[PDB]
Amino acid sequence: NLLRHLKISKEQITPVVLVVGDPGRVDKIKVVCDSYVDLAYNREYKSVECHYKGQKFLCVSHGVGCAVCFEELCQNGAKVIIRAGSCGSLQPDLIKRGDICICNAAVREDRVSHLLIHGDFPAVGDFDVYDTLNKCAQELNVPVFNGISVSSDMYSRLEDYSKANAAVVELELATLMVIGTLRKVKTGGILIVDGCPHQLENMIKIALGACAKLATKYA
Amino acid sequence: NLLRHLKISKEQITPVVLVVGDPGRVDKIKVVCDSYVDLAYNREYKSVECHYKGQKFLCVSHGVGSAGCAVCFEELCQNGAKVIIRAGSCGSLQPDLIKRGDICICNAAVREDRVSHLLIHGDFPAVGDFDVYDTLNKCAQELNVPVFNGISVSSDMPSRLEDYSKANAAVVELELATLMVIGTLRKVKTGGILIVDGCPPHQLENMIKIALGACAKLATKYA
């Protein structure tokens, strides 16, 4: 009565799930919550039940593998999924190392989404997830950018997309969005800037706050 | 000091603009407004200043069958438009759920359109502004009008449409993907609202009301 790559029960899977990269970043989030319960740890896939602002939701990692992670979650009960992680600025003059970006859509430069549907199909997140993230960030008077991510599975064309007004670049958000849209799962992403080809805690607060706010509607 | 394909002044171009297909549908919107002023008429391009709920914004047509929409959107984005909304018709790709007569507010589109691909690689999303989408939904609910939300297939016409339909695309029409991308390239906020034709009446007035209402609401933030 368990799942393959996550090693947790379908019973344990919450409506809202928060997905991150490094499994250590999951350990850094559980502590910040009101309370938590560890569920499992499997090669690269850590899963913890997070209790925060009255609500209960999973936080789960998969490595710095994401496709199968998102697949598994969408199959087995996730209604909302949010990715929090890092990215690169594609607007160096405006968006600077340390800035936070909430993304509503992405450029499909990713192997996996193209295996599932023709590239013309938009990688786009849920509105109410995007709204919820913005309102938490403003409620905590934290300035945040909004824009489009280039989801690219290596990192060029990045110049093109940058001058097409893409904000940031990361690996997997386009994958989540499409899987989400295919599986009727609401998705979003929030990202903090690394390179450019304290703030982290605020982002996590936005992410956690948003998750709690969304979790309300399924409890 | 006036523009090429639209035949109106850059001074006359408002922050918010409403774009429709058939120029007869512009005549059907005039009536619904509080007041209006005609600006110009050029082969297929009718342009009217619309006054509604205290605000002033352009309404413009450009033809059926994806005529010269690209140049229309280009012209508007070049010369001051900050928000652009497309109202028009479409086909249901979810026959059991979405029926002839239903209204759909779209947040994104499938790029099956010649023109967007000439401008940026197909991987780039055709996606609307979320505040425009929010504003349309709230007008439709404020007027207790039920509306669908979903993705449009913007197509210039074999049965990829099956694929997209089972990928949960809601409707199909001609040019919304084009607007969104031009919008995103030119830093102009876009959105779209559509009424169903047929798969494979009164309601039109509600849609126009949503469109007009949303435009007014957005126009506030620039006036």
Domain that holds residue B31: 1-223
The answer to whether residue A165 neighbours chain B at the CB level (below 8 Å) is yes
169-208 in chain A: CB under 8 A from chain B = 181-182, 184
Interchain proximity A107–B123, CB inside 8 Å: yes
Instruction: Kindly state the helix (H) or strand (E) to which residue A170 belongs, with its residue range.
Output: strand A168-170
| Cα A166 from Cα A105, distance rounded (Å) | 10
Query: B43's torsion region: left (phi>0), alpha (psi -120 to 50) or beta?
Result: left
Interchain proximity B112–A106, CB inside 8 Å: no
Interchain proximity B168–A182, CB inside 8 Å: yes
| Cα A122 from Cα A133, distance rounded (Å) | 21
**Three-state SS sequence of A3-40:** CCCCCCCCCCCCCEEEEECCHHHHHHHHCCCCEEEEEE
The answer to whether residue B107 neighbours chain A at the CB level (below 8 Å) is yes
State the resolution, in angstroms.
2.6
| Cα A106 from Cα A128, distance rounded (Å) | 17
**Per the structure block, which two tokens stand in for A35?**
């309370």
| Cα A183 from Cα B167, distance rounded (Å) | 8
* Number of domains, chain A: 1
Looking at CA atoms only, how far is residue B207 from chain A in angstroms? 21
Residues B144-154, buried b or exposed e (16+ Cβ, 10 A)?
Answer: eeebbbbbbbb
φ/ψ of residue B162, rounded to 5? -60, -50
Question: CATH number of the domain that B150 lies in?
Answer: 3.40.50.1580
The answer to whether residue A107 neighbours chain B at the CB level (below 8 Å) is yes
* Catalytic annotation present for A34: no
The residue written with tokens 């690689």 in the block is B121
This entry's atomic model was obtained through X-ray
φ/ψ of residue B80, rounded to 5? 115, -15
Catalytic residue among B22, B131, B134, B197: B197
Q: Which of B124, B134, B151 sits opposite A161 (nearest CB)?
A: B124
| Cα dihedral B205, B12, B131, A178 sign | positive
Nearest by Cα to B219 from B211, B77, B126, B8: B211
- A200 Cβ contact list (under 8 Å, min separation 6): A192
Interchain proximity B168–A161, CB inside 8 Å: no
The answer to whether residue A91 neighbours chain B at the CB level (below 8 Å) is no
For chain B, breaks with the C atom over 2.5 A from the next N come after 157, 200
Query: B144's torsion region: left (phi>0), alpha (psi -120 to 50) or beta?
Result: left
Q: How many CB pairs under 8 A join A and B?
A: 77
* Distance in Å from the first CA to the final CA of chain B: 23
- A79 Cβ contact list (under 8 Å, min separation 6): A15, A16, A185, A186, A218
